[PDB]
Write an enzyme that holds these catalytic residues in place. Sequence first.
Site, PDB file in Angstrom:
ATOM      1  N   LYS A   1      -2.614  15.888  45.107  1.00 50.21           N
ATOM      2  CA  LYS A   1      -3.571  15.648  44.035  1.00 50.21           C
ATOM      3  C   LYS A   1      -3.450  14.193  43.553  1.00 50.21           C
ATOM      4  O   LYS A   1      -4.266  13.407  43.465  1.00 50.21           O
ATOM      5  CB  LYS A   1      -4.028  16.659  43.100  1.00 50.21           C
ATOM      6  CG  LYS A   1      -5.425  16.137  42.659  1.00 50.21           C
ATOM      7  CD  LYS A   1      -5.835  17.445  41.351  1.00 50.21           C
ATOM      8  CE  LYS A   1      -7.023  16.854  40.756  1.00 50.21           C
ATOM      9  NZ  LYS A   1      -7.544  18.340  39.870  1.00 50.21           N
TER      10      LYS A   1
ATOM     11  N   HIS B   1       0.353  13.971  37.162  1.00 49.34           N
ATOM     12  CA  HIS B   1      -0.714  13.359  36.318  1.00 49.34           C
ATOM     13  C   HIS B   1      -0.693  11.800  35.961  1.00 49.34           C
ATOM     14  O   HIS B   1       0.430  11.220  35.698  1.00 49.34           O
ATOM     15  CB  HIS B   1      -0.857  14.042  35.068  1.00 49.34           C
ATOM     16  CG  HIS B   1      -1.329  15.739  35.119  1.00 49.34           C
ATOM     17  ND1 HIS B   1      -0.163  16.544  34.720  1.00 49.34           N
ATOM     18  CD2 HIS B   1      -2.101  16.479  35.807  1.00 49.34           C
ATOM     19  CE1 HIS B   1      -0.747  17.822  35.044  1.00 49.34           C
ATOM     20  NE2 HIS B   1      -1.779  17.564  35.716  1.00 49.34           N
ATOM     21  N   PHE B   2      -1.673  11.090  36.068  1.00 50.18           N
ATOM     22  CA  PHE B   2      -1.522   9.956  35.336  1.00 50.18           C
ATOM     23  C   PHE B   2      -1.974   9.955  34.044  1.00 50.18           C
ATOM     24  O   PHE B   2      -3.082  10.114  33.593  1.00 50.18           O
ATOM     25  CB  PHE B   2      -2.323   8.811  36.128  1.00 50.18           C
ATOM     26  CG  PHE B   2      -2.212   7.406  35.922  1.00 50.18           C
ATOM     27  CD1 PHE B   2      -1.312   6.622  36.694  1.00 50.18           C
ATOM     28  CD2 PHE B   2      -2.860   6.691  34.589  1.00 50.18           C
ATOM     29  CE1 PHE B   2      -1.083   5.117  36.297  1.00 50.18           C
ATOM     30  CE2 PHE B   2      -2.416   5.499  34.402  1.00 50.18           C
ATOM     31  CZ  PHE B   2      -1.704   4.720  35.191  1.00 50.18           C
ATOM     32  N   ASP B   3      -0.948   9.556  32.996  1.00 46.73           N
ATOM     33  CA  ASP B   3      -1.091   9.434  31.569  1.00 46.73           C
ATOM     34  C   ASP B   3      -1.997   8.483  31.074  1.00 46.73           C
ATOM     35  O   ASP B   3      -2.868   8.406  30.002  1.00 46.73           O
ATOM     36  CB  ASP B   3       0.137  10.073  30.898  1.00 46.73           C
ATOM     37  CG  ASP B   3      -0.272  10.734  29.385  1.00 46.73           C
ATOM     38  OD1 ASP B   3      -0.953  11.907  29.855  1.00 46.73           O
ATOM     39  OD2 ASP B   3       0.200  10.360  28.397  1.00 46.73           O
TER      40      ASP B   3
ATOM     41  N   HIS C   1      -4.599   8.502  42.697  1.00 51.52           N
ATOM     42  CA  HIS C   1      -3.729   7.588  41.760  1.00 51.52           C
ATOM     43  C   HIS C   1      -2.850   6.732  42.607  1.00 51.52           C
ATOM     44  O   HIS C   1      -2.379   5.491  42.193  1.00 51.52           O
ATOM     45  CB  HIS C   1      -2.833   7.973  40.896  1.00 51.52           C
ATOM     46  CG  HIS C   1      -3.606   8.845  39.856  1.00 51.52           C
ATOM     47  ND1 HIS C   1      -4.745   8.326  38.927  1.00 51.52           N
ATOM     48  CD2 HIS C   1      -3.719  10.221  39.174  1.00 51.52           C
ATOM     49  CE1 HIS C   1      -5.165   9.147  38.344  1.00 51.52           C
ATOM     50  NE2 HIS C   1      -4.708  10.280  38.447  1.00 51.52           N
TER      51      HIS C   1
ATOM     52  N   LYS D   1     -16.497  10.874  38.205  1.00 49.95           N
ATOM     53  CA  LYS D   1     -14.961  10.762  37.451  1.00 49.95           C
ATOM     54  C   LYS D   1     -15.043   9.464  36.565  1.00 49.95           C
ATOM     55  O   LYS D   1     -15.345   8.137  37.173  1.00 49.95           O
ATOM     56  CB  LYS D   1     -13.874  10.702  38.331  1.00 49.95           C
ATOM     57  CG  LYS D   1     -12.590  10.944  37.467  1.00 49.95           C
ATOM     58  CD  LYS D   1     -11.323  11.044  38.154  1.00 49.95           C
ATOM     59  CE  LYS D   1     -10.160  11.312  37.341  1.00 49.95           C
ATOM     60  NZ  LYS D   1      -8.632  11.156  38.007  1.00 49.95           N
TER      61      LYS D   1
ATOM     62  N   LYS E   1       0.237  12.149  26.145  1.00 45.35           N
ATOM     63  CA  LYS E   1      -0.765  12.090  25.200  1.00 45.35           C
ATOM     64  C   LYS E   1      -1.280  13.723  24.701  1.00 45.35           C
ATOM     65  O   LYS E   1      -1.804  13.568  23.549  1.00 45.35           O
ATOM     66  CB  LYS E   1      -2.040  11.500  25.759  1.00 45.35           C
ATOM     67  CG  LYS E   1      -2.041  10.077  25.896  1.00 45.35           C
ATOM     68  CD  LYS E   1      -3.132   9.500  26.501  1.00 45.35           C
ATOM     69  CE  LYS E   1      -3.064   7.741  26.498  1.00 45.35           C
ATOM     70  NZ  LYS E   1      -4.333   7.138  27.189  1.00 45.35           N
TER      71      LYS E   1
ATOM     72  N   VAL F   1     -12.849   7.591  34.275  1.00 46.39           N
ATOM     73  CA  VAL F   1     -11.845   6.701  34.333  1.00 46.39           C
ATOM     74  C   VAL F   1     -10.870   7.222  35.425  1.00 46.39           C
ATOM     75  O   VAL F   1     -10.530   8.422  35.512  1.00 46.39           O
ATOM     76  CB  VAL F   1     -11.164   6.551  32.862  1.00 46.39           C
ATOM     77  CG1 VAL F   1     -12.565   6.438  31.805  1.00 46.39           C
ATOM     78  CG2 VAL F   1     -10.322   7.958  32.225  1.00 46.39           C
TER      79      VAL F   1
HETATM   80  C1  LIG Z   1      -6.089   6.885  30.044  1.00 45.03           C
HETATM   81  C2  LIG Z   1      -6.051   6.999  31.679  1.00 45.03           C
HETATM   82  C3  LIG Z   1      -6.475   8.345  32.108  1.00 45.03           C
HETATM   83  N1  LIG Z   1      -6.821   8.443  33.514  1.00 45.03           N
HETATM   84  C4  LIG Z   1      -7.223   9.683  34.084  1.00 45.03           C
HETATM   85  C5  LIG Z   1      -6.173  10.810  33.918  1.00 45.03           C
HETATM   86  C6  LIG Z   1      -7.124  12.145  33.825  1.00 45.03           C
HETATM   87  O1  LIG Z   1      -8.089  12.418  35.169  1.00 45.03           O
HETATM   88  C7  LIG Z   1      -8.177  11.440  32.780  1.00 45.03           C
HETATM   89  C8  LIG Z   1      -7.732  11.941  31.279  1.00 45.03           C
HETATM   90  N2  LIG Z   1      -8.649  11.440  30.009  1.00 45.03           N
HETATM   91  C9  LIG Z   1      -9.268  12.650  29.802  1.00 45.03           C
HETATM   92  C10 LIG Z   1      -9.883  12.581  28.345  1.00 45.03           C
HETATM   93  C11 LIG Z   1     -10.223  11.119  27.864  1.00 45.03           C
HETATM   94  C12 LIG Z   1     -10.450  10.300  29.332  1.00 45.03           C
HETATM   95  C13 LIG Z   1      -9.473  10.354  30.321  1.00 45.03           C
HETATM   96  O2  LIG Z   1      -8.358  10.316  32.964  1.00 45.03           O
HETATM   97  C14 LIG Z   1      -6.404   7.419  34.409  1.00 45.03           C
HETATM   98  O3  LIG Z   1      -6.469   7.535  35.571  1.00 45.03           O
HETATM   99  N3  LIG Z   1      -6.053   6.267  33.758  1.00 45.03           N
HETATM  100  C15 LIG Z   1      -5.825   5.906  32.497  1.00 45.03           C
HETATM  101  O4  LIG Z   1      -5.399   5.057  32.222  1.00 45.03           O
END
Ligand SMILES: Cc1cn([C@H]2C[C@H](O)[C@@H](CN3CCCCC3)O2)c(=O)[nH]c1=O
Length: 124
Positions: A7, A119-121, A12, A41, A66, A43
Site C-alpha cells: 500500500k 506510512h508517509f508522515d 507513495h 484523497k 505526528k 493530500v
Molecule cells: C502531511 C502529509 C500527509 N500525507 C498523507 C498520509 C496520510 O494518508 C494522510 C495523513 N493526514 C491525515 C490528517 C491530516 C491530513 C493528512 O495524508 C502525505 O502523503 N504527505 C504529507 O506530506
Amino acid sequence: KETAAAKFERQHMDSSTSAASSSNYCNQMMKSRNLTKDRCKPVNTFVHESLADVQAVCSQKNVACKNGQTNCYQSYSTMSITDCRETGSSKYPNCAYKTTQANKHIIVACEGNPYVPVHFDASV
Ligand SMILES: Cc1cn([C@H]2C[C@H](O)[C@@H](CN3CCCCC3)O2)c(=O)[nH]c1=O
C-alpha cells in the site's frame, strides 16, 4: 490482499520520473494509483527515488511520528518528491489536484520484519 508495505508503494512510490511532474501529474497519478475511488484523497506525496533508497530511510534518523508513535524516520538526504493537494474546485468523482515538486527530507513510519515503510508522515 495488499500488505501495508505494498500500500505504501502504491500510494507513495514513483521511481519512474526524476522530477518532471507535469501540471497534469497529480490529476493522473491520484487516479491511476486508485486514490480517487472512495473519495478524492485530499493530500498525498509521491517519492521519486529508488525503492531501495526509500526503504533505507527505516535505518536513518529516528524521529517522533505526528501521531506520537516512535517509529518514524527522517531521510539523511533530501529526496525528489511531488506533493498532491486537492483544489477547492475539485468535486468527486472529478478529483482535481495542485502538483508541487520539491526536494525535501522525507519522514516515514516503518513496521514489520522486514522493517519497511508503511506510512508517509511528513516532509521537512
Ligand atoms: C502531511 C502529509 C500527509 N500525507 C498523507 C498520509 C496520510 O494518508 C494522510 C495523513 N493526514 C491525515 C490528517 C491530516 C491530513 C493528512 O495524508 C502525505 O502523503 N504527505 C504529507 O506530506
